[PDB]
Amino acid sequence: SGFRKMAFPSGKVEGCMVQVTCGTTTLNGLWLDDVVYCPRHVICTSEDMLNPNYEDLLIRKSNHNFLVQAGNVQLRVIGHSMQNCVLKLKVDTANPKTPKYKFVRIQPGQTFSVLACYNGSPSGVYQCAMRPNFTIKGSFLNGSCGSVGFNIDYDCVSFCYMHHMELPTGVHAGTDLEGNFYGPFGDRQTAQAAGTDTTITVNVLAWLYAAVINGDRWFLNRFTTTLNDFNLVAMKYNYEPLTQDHVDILGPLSAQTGIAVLDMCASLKELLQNGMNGRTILGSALLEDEFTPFDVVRQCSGVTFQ
Amino acid sequence: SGFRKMAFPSGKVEGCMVQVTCGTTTLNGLWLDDVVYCPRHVICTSEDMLNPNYEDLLIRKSNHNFLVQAGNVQLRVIGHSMQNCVLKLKVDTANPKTPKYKFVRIQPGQTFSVLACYNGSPSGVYQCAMRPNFTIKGSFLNGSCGSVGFNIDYDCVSFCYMHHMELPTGVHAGTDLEGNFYGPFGDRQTAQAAGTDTTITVNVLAWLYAAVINGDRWFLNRFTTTLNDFNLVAMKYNYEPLTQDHVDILGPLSAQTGIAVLDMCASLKELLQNGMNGRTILGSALLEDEFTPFDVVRQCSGVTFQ
Ligand SMILES: *C(=N)[C@H](C[C@@H]1CCNC1=O)NC(=O)[C@@H]1[C@@H]2[C@H](CN1C(=O)[C@@H](NC(=O)C(F)(F)F)C(C)(C)C)C2(C)C
Ligand SMILES: *C(=N)[C@H](C[C@@H]1CCNC1=O)NC(=O)[C@@H]1[C@@H]2[C@H](CN1C(=O)[C@@H](NC(=O)C(F)(F)F)C(C)(C)C)C2(C)C
């Protein structure tokens, strides 16, 4: 029993982190086979960040301008190119610790673990969700860019995020590993703001199921609702619409507990309309939306990674 | 910016996890040099758990009765002994992945990361605190015993917890790596209950400082208090006493922010007496007590591990 915001084991990703320095600037890179992936703004000076011409700044860099270190060990750069907002530095040594891996572009609502790093070394690991406004609520400081977000499925690490920047309110934005930003953001120090966020309804329902599984059942009521009528309430409280696909994805937890998804929807409707009146669910005073259905099942069934 | 419940990178500990099977029962072990540490109740059958005589059950086991596997690879057991509530299985192969490590007995109030494991494989990592009642609020299922809790300082893993059992309310109990339980518990399926818990006052203050550092300052008031008068309020709300040592330990965060510890105490006093009136601090609707002063500084300054 118990339910925690649980991150993936980070060892496979730790073996891939390196330091990338270009002149003054040092940030993190990801070393897979003989390629190091890092944010392209490593090539910028504190002078011009308001709007760099990255393509131009890069023509004036050569391989030797990039100091890549894996721990103590320098890795010689033997080629370089830019793909959208990331640099790919070909090095003379393939990482012997390269896990089985894929690059994925996650969808808003999905979760992943961030391995926060500085100077190529890990500081810590935590779980996040890609928010509907394409930000993540992370914890990042100067020097953290190039830190990555990932999922693990058995033996395969799916890299889905690389960290690039921090928006007003202290939320964070970044790219997939092909260097394409999530959301309408770019890597320039200009006036950018996240869109209004929304609550990930299907994840809240998944967490309510997690609560029932753990014995925290006080919020279950006797009623049901239709999908359409539920979504009218969701909208008012800035919850995203629940689709039939969401309902189907909740099927395993619904089956395990015997609580139809629409019955759980009626219980969530009442929580939105009436609040929690000082009670908690799974120790929380607010409704939690950063556990997917798969996260709940993984944690409550003990899924492990090879 | 941002502030997250952050766990230590788990790679050093992952390389140490193994599966230990004795007859039916399989749980996790920790493989350091040529010794595997695991909970002694691996030698029990589902028949007698209400009160095993472990010393007796062990005399009838020989080395070959223990199947130890590190991934696919069997490790031959060449000796065995019991130390309090853990078994030490000497094996014929030293773990080549053994990190620099120590065994520590943590104090209530301190935090550590748990690497939850099943069948010798990691499921996930999360941060916990040793509660004043010597429990942790973890997430554990059948088969998770032998999962360990740890801190990292530079290159050194301090192992402080091994998981043994779950108490009513869904809280968890275990031992240090010398097999001595934290708290008044034992490894027998009998009526055991945690004592009444209390809130870790010094950690709440540390988190309030973390909030100020992140710009969330609405709860700061203009007043101060004495240590003695603050502790009278703390007591009423089931907060542990704040000592001068606690004040001194908060010195770095007090210096960084310019807010005297006793000024922050006056602000916490007001939160306890008046509540938060629907506001949040660092995204939370409740006061958080599972960040130590060192955790806050580590996260807000980017401390990394070699
Ligand atoms: C990479 N190491 C840092 C990570 C930032 C730094 C503080 N916390 C973070 O997550 N990334 C940057 O410094 C990027 C970088 C230029 C400036 N920048 C920002 O994150 C800035 N934000 C924005 O410009 C805004 F508001 F548009 F998001 C800053 C104001 C410094 C936080 C480039 C190339 C975007
Ligand atoms: C080790 N793999 C499990 C972990 C438990 C199992 C469910 N969630 C956990 O953390 N440990 C046990 O099964 C231990 C073991 C006997 C029974 N046990 C318990 O945790 C039981 N608890 C107690 O007896 C109580 F209440 F005293 F804490 C159980 C009721 C099965 C949860 C021994 C040797 C303690």
PDB file of C-alpha atoms in Angstrom, chain A residues 34-213:
ATOM      1  CA  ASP A  34      28.998   8.120 -31.004  1.00  0.00           C
ATOM      2  CA  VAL A  35      26.719  11.186 -30.942  1.00  0.00           C
ATOM      3  CA  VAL A  36      26.282  13.825 -28.217  1.00  0.00           C
ATOM      4  CA  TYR A  37      22.972  15.736 -28.286  1.00  0.00           C
ATOM      5  CA  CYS A  38      22.827  19.132 -26.540  1.00  0.00           C
ATOM      6  CA  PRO A  39      20.947  22.439 -26.715  1.00  0.00           C
ATOM      7  CA  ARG A  40      22.212  24.648 -29.493  1.00  0.00           C
ATOM      8  CA  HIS A  41      22.445  27.712 -27.263  1.00  0.00           C
ATOM      9  CA  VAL A  42      25.670  26.318 -25.821  1.00  0.00           C
ATOM     10  CA  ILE A  43      27.271  28.217 -28.725  1.00  0.00           C
ATOM     11  CA  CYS A  44      25.942  31.579 -27.481  1.00  0.00           C
ATOM     12  CA  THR A  45      27.652  34.138 -25.289  1.00  0.00           C
ATOM     13  CA  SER A  46      25.853  36.088 -22.585  1.00  0.00           C
ATOM     14  CA  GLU A  47      26.217  38.978 -25.055  1.00  0.00           C
ATOM     15  CA  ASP A  48      23.507  38.047 -27.576  1.00  0.00           C
ATOM     16  CA  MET A  49      20.652  35.918 -26.290  1.00  0.00           C
ATOM     17  CA  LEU A  50      17.743  38.244 -27.128  1.00  0.00           C
ATOM     18  CA  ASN A  51      17.718  36.853 -30.649  1.00  0.00           C
ATOM     19  CA  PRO A  52      20.650  34.760 -31.863  1.00  0.00           C
ATOM     20  CA  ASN A  53      21.107  33.664 -35.444  1.00  0.00           C
ATOM     21  CA  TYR A  54      22.153  30.177 -34.484  1.00  0.00           C
ATOM     22  CA  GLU A  55      22.898  29.038 -38.026  1.00  0.00           C
ATOM     23  CA  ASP A  56      25.303  31.959 -38.369  1.00  0.00           C
ATOM     24  CA  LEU A  57      27.028  31.510 -35.005  1.00  0.00           C
ATOM     25  CA  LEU A  58      27.594  27.826 -35.811  1.00  0.00           C
ATOM     26  CA  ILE A  59      29.361  28.346 -39.172  1.00  0.00           C
ATOM     27  CA  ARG A  60      32.147  30.027 -37.184  1.00  0.00           C
ATOM     28  CA  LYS A  61      32.561  27.048 -34.822  1.00  0.00           C
ATOM     29  CA  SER A  62      34.792  24.064 -35.578  1.00  0.00           C
ATOM     30  CA  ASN A  63      34.896  20.629 -33.946  1.00  0.00           C
ATOM     31  CA  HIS A  64      37.701  21.607 -31.552  1.00  0.00           C
ATOM     32  CA  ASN A  65      35.676  24.530 -30.187  1.00  0.00           C
ATOM     33  CA  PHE A  66      33.496  21.933 -28.398  1.00  0.00           C
ATOM     34  CA  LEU A  67      34.948  20.453 -25.224  1.00  0.00           C
ATOM     35  CA  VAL A  68      32.927  17.289 -24.453  1.00  0.00           C
ATOM     36  CA  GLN A  69      33.686  15.461 -21.204  1.00  0.00           C
ATOM     37  CA  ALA A  70      32.254  12.212 -19.838  1.00  0.00           C
ATOM     38  CA  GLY A  71      33.327  12.375 -16.232  1.00  0.00           C
ATOM     39  CA  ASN A  72      37.050  13.138 -16.279  1.00  0.00           C
ATOM     40  CA  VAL A  73      37.434  11.913 -19.843  1.00  0.00           C
ATOM     41  CA  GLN A  74      37.538  14.221 -22.846  1.00  0.00           C
ATOM     42  CA  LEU A  75      35.682  12.949 -25.900  1.00  0.00           C
ATOM     43  CA  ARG A  76      37.111  14.269 -29.162  1.00  0.00           C
ATOM     44  CA  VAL A  77      34.489  15.884 -31.383  1.00  0.00           C
ATOM     45  CA  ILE A  78      34.932  14.820 -35.002  1.00  0.00           C
ATOM     46  CA  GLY A  79      31.813  16.392 -36.497  1.00  0.00           C
ATOM     47  CA  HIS A  80      28.953  18.711 -35.696  1.00  0.00           C
ATOM     48  CA  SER A  81      25.592  19.680 -37.121  1.00  0.00           C
ATOM     49  CA  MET A  82      22.379  21.389 -36.044  1.00  0.00           C
ATOM     50  CA  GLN A  83      18.912  19.849 -36.195  1.00  0.00           C
ATOM     51  CA  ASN A  84      16.238  22.387 -35.205  1.00  0.00           C
ATOM     52  CA  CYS A  85      17.205  23.521 -31.672  1.00  0.00           C
ATOM     53  CA  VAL A  86      19.734  20.777 -30.818  1.00  0.00           C
ATOM     54  CA  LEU A  87      23.346  20.183 -31.810  1.00  0.00           C
ATOM     55  CA  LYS A  88      24.559  16.697 -32.710  1.00  0.00           C
ATOM     56  CA  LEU A  89      28.282  16.371 -31.933  1.00  0.00           C
ATOM     57  CA  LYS A  90      29.835  13.269 -33.482  1.00  0.00           C
ATOM     58  CA  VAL A  91      32.593  11.980 -31.213  1.00  0.00           C
ATOM     59  CA  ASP A  92      35.435   9.511 -31.728  1.00  0.00           C
ATOM     60  CA  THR A  93      34.151   7.093 -29.045  1.00  0.00           C
ATOM     61  CA  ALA A  94      30.824   5.302 -28.863  1.00  0.00           C
ATOM     62  CA  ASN A  95      29.295   5.291 -25.391  1.00  0.00           C
ATOM     63  CA  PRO A  96      29.780   1.719 -24.063  1.00  0.00           C
ATOM     64  CA  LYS A  97      26.910   2.401 -21.656  1.00  0.00           C
ATOM     65  CA  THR A  98      24.392   3.196 -24.397  1.00  0.00           C
ATOM     66  CA  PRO A  99      21.069   1.582 -23.406  1.00  0.00           C
ATOM     67  CA  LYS A 100      18.461   0.378 -25.802  1.00  0.00           C
ATOM     68  CA  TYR A 101      16.636   3.605 -26.597  1.00  0.00           C
ATOM     69  CA  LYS A 102      14.156   5.466 -28.791  1.00  0.00           C
ATOM     70  CA  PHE A 103      13.332   9.130 -29.354  1.00  0.00           C
ATOM     71  CA  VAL A 104       9.615   9.810 -28.758  1.00  0.00           C
ATOM     72  CA  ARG A 105       7.479  12.936 -28.977  1.00  0.00           C
ATOM     73  CA  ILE A 106       5.081  12.661 -26.013  1.00  0.00           C
ATOM     74  CA  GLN A 107       1.600  13.945 -25.931  1.00  0.00           C
ATOM     75  CA  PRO A 108       0.254  16.488 -23.461  1.00  0.00           C
ATOM     76  CA  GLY A 109      -1.032  14.602 -20.483  1.00  0.00           C
ATOM     77  CA  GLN A 110       1.712  11.996 -20.498  1.00  0.00           C
ATOM     78  CA  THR A 111       4.315  11.731 -17.754  1.00  0.00           C
ATOM     79  CA  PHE A 112       8.072  11.201 -17.679  1.00  0.00           C
ATOM     80  CA  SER A 113      11.035  11.407 -15.311  1.00  0.00           C
ATOM     81  CA  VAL A 114      13.578  14.242 -15.485  1.00  0.00           C
ATOM     82  CA  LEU A 115      17.180  13.594 -14.485  1.00  0.00           C
ATOM     83  CA  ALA A 116      18.269  17.105 -13.489  1.00  0.00           C
ATOM     84  CA  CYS A 117      21.998  17.580 -14.211  1.00  0.00           C
ATOM     85  CA  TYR A 118      24.709  20.277 -13.860  1.00  0.00           C
ATOM     86  CA  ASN A 119      28.156  20.089 -15.514  1.00  0.00           C
ATOM     87  CA  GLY A 120      27.297  16.650 -16.848  1.00  0.00           C
ATOM     88  CA  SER A 121      26.607  15.226 -13.363  1.00  0.00           C
ATOM     89  CA  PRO A 122      23.221  14.244 -11.900  1.00  0.00           C
ATOM     90  CA  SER A 123      21.602  16.273  -9.148  1.00  0.00           C
ATOM     91  CA  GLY A 124      18.339  14.323  -8.796  1.00  0.00           C
ATOM     92  CA  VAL A 125      15.353  12.689 -10.430  1.00  0.00           C
ATOM     93  CA  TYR A 126      11.668  13.560 -10.329  1.00  0.00           C
ATOM     94  CA  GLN A 127       8.479  12.784 -12.227  1.00  0.00           C
ATOM     95  CA  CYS A 128       6.658  15.407 -14.304  1.00  0.00           C
ATOM     96  CA  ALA A 129       3.760  15.684 -16.735  1.00  0.00           C
ATOM     97  CA  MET A 130       3.677  17.423 -20.123  1.00  0.00           C
ATOM     98  CA  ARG A 131       0.988  19.972 -19.372  1.00  0.00           C
ATOM     99  CA  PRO A 132      -1.793  20.804 -21.834  1.00  0.00           C
ATOM    100  CA  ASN A 133      -0.053  24.154 -22.414  1.00  0.00           C
ATOM    101  CA  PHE A 134       3.134  22.268 -23.359  1.00  0.00           C
ATOM    102  CA  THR A 135       5.111  23.285 -20.264  1.00  0.00           C
ATOM    103  CA  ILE A 136       6.397  21.148 -17.430  1.00  0.00           C
ATOM    104  CA  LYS A 137       6.452  22.097 -13.766  1.00  0.00           C
ATOM    105  CA  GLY A 138      10.068  21.242 -13.134  1.00  0.00           C
ATOM    106  CA  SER A 139      12.936  22.312 -10.922  1.00  0.00           C
ATOM    107  CA  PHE A 140      15.816  23.767 -12.945  1.00  0.00           C
ATOM    108  CA  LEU A 141      18.643  26.302 -12.443  1.00  0.00           C
ATOM    109  CA  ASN A 142      21.359  27.901 -14.552  1.00  0.00           C
ATOM    110  CA  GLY A 143      23.354  25.169 -16.203  1.00  0.00           C
ATOM    111  CA  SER A 144      20.586  22.568 -16.271  1.00  0.00           C
ATOM    112  CA  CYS A 145      19.881  22.760 -19.995  1.00  0.00           C
ATOM    113  CA  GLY A 146      20.488  19.475 -21.744  1.00  0.00           C
ATOM    114  CA  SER A 147      18.944  17.590 -18.835  1.00  0.00           C
ATOM    115  CA  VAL A 148      16.545  15.072 -20.341  1.00  0.00           C
ATOM    116  CA  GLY A 149      13.158  13.530 -19.627  1.00  0.00           C
ATOM    117  CA  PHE A 150      12.459   9.880 -20.286  1.00  0.00           C
ATOM    118  CA  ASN A 151      10.251   6.839 -19.810  1.00  0.00           C
ATOM    119  CA  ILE A 152      11.441   3.241 -19.461  1.00  0.00           C
ATOM    120  CA  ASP A 153       9.558   0.193 -20.802  1.00  0.00           C
ATOM    121  CA  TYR A 154      11.358  -3.032 -19.784  1.00  0.00           C
ATOM    122  CA  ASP A 155      14.857  -2.430 -21.166  1.00  0.00           C
ATOM    123  CA  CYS A 156      14.114   0.483 -23.518  1.00  0.00           C
ATOM    124  CA  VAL A 157      14.608   4.155 -22.570  1.00  0.00           C
ATOM    125  CA  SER A 158      12.293   6.450 -24.535  1.00  0.00           C
ATOM    126  CA  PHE A 159      13.853   9.925 -24.464  1.00  0.00           C
ATOM    127  CA  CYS A 160      11.099  12.488 -24.829  1.00  0.00           C
ATOM    128  CA  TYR A 161      12.392  15.815 -23.444  1.00  0.00           C
ATOM    129  CA  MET A 162      15.500  17.986 -23.372  1.00  0.00           C
ATOM    130  CA  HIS A 163      15.491  21.083 -21.208  1.00  0.00           C
ATOM    131  CA  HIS A 164      16.033  24.513 -22.773  1.00  0.00           C
ATOM    132  CA  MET A 165      14.376  27.342 -20.886  1.00  0.00           C
ATOM    133  CA  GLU A 166      12.251  28.729 -18.079  1.00  0.00           C
ATOM    134  CA  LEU A 167       9.066  30.797 -18.658  1.00  0.00           C
ATOM    135  CA  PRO A 168       7.431  33.354 -16.324  1.00  0.00           C
ATOM    136  CA  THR A 169       5.684  31.691 -13.348  1.00  0.00           C
ATOM    137  CA  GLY A 170       8.677  29.372 -13.031  1.00  0.00           C
ATOM    138  CA  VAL A 171       7.484  26.714 -15.510  1.00  0.00           C
ATOM    139  CA  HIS A 172       9.748  25.055 -18.054  1.00  0.00           C
ATOM    140  CA  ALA A 173       9.978  24.472 -21.781  1.00  0.00           C
ATOM    141  CA  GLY A 174      12.085  22.295 -23.985  1.00  0.00           C
ATOM    142  CA  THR A 175      12.286  20.099 -27.052  1.00  0.00           C
ATOM    143  CA  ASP A 176      12.072  16.514 -28.148  1.00  0.00           C
ATOM    144  CA  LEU A 177      15.370  14.880 -29.039  1.00  0.00           C
ATOM    145  CA  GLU A 178      14.959  16.005 -32.633  1.00  0.00           C
ATOM    146  CA  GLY A 179      15.182  19.569 -31.339  1.00  0.00           C
ATOM    147  CA  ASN A 180      11.571  20.583 -31.924  1.00  0.00           C
ATOM    148  CA  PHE A 181      10.027  22.563 -29.102  1.00  0.00           C
ATOM    149  CA  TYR A 182       6.975  21.419 -27.276  1.00  0.00           C
ATOM    150  CA  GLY A 183       4.523  24.288 -27.495  1.00  0.00           C
ATOM    151  CA  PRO A 184       4.735  27.653 -29.249  1.00  0.00           C
ATOM    152  CA  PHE A 185       8.134  28.522 -27.746  1.00  0.00           C
ATOM    153  CA  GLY A 186      11.597  29.213 -29.112  1.00  0.00           C
ATOM    154  CA  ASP A 187      15.119  29.372 -27.703  1.00  0.00           C
ATOM    155  CA  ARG A 188      15.493  33.128 -27.542  1.00  0.00           C
ATOM    156  CA  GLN A 189      15.351  35.506 -24.607  1.00  0.00           C
ATOM    157  CA  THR A 190      12.216  37.317 -25.653  1.00  0.00           C
ATOM    158  CA  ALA A 191       8.771  37.889 -24.169  1.00  0.00           C
ATOM    159  CA  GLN A 192       7.237  34.412 -24.183  1.00  0.00           C
ATOM    160  CA  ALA A 193       4.422  33.228 -21.963  1.00  0.00           C
ATOM    161  CA  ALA A 194       2.713  29.889 -21.482  1.00  0.00           C
ATOM    162  CA  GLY A 195      -0.901  29.657 -22.550  1.00  0.00           C
ATOM    163  CA  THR A 196      -3.505  29.098 -19.868  1.00  0.00           C
ATOM    164  CA  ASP A 197      -3.124  25.601 -18.463  1.00  0.00           C
ATOM    165  CA  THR A 198      -5.873  23.038 -17.844  1.00  0.00           C
ATOM    166  CA  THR A 199      -6.256  20.047 -15.539  1.00  0.00           C
ATOM    167  CA  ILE A 200      -5.665  16.595 -17.035  1.00  0.00           C
ATOM    168  CA  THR A 201      -9.044  15.003 -16.313  1.00  0.00           C
ATOM    169  CA  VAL A 202      -8.192  11.399 -17.230  1.00  0.00           C
ATOM    170  CA  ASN A 203      -5.181  11.522 -14.868  1.00  0.00           C
ATOM    171  CA  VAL A 204      -7.309  12.840 -11.999  1.00  0.00           C
ATOM    172  CA  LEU A 205      -9.688   9.911 -12.498  1.00  0.00           C
ATOM    173  CA  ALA A 206      -6.716   7.509 -12.559  1.00  0.00           C
ATOM    174  CA  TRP A 207      -5.560   8.873  -9.201  1.00  0.00           C
ATOM    175  CA  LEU A 208      -9.027   8.539  -7.716  1.00  0.00           C
ATOM    176  CA  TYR A 209      -8.887   4.870  -8.731  1.00  0.00           C
ATOM    177  CA  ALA A 210      -5.470   4.649  -7.043  1.00  0.00           C
ATOM    178  CA  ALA A 211      -7.112   6.011  -3.925  1.00  0.00           C
ATOM    179  CA  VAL A 212      -9.864   3.402  -4.008  1.00  0.00           C
ATOM    180  CA  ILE A 213      -7.267   0.659  -4.462  1.00  0.00           C
TER     181      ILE A 213
END
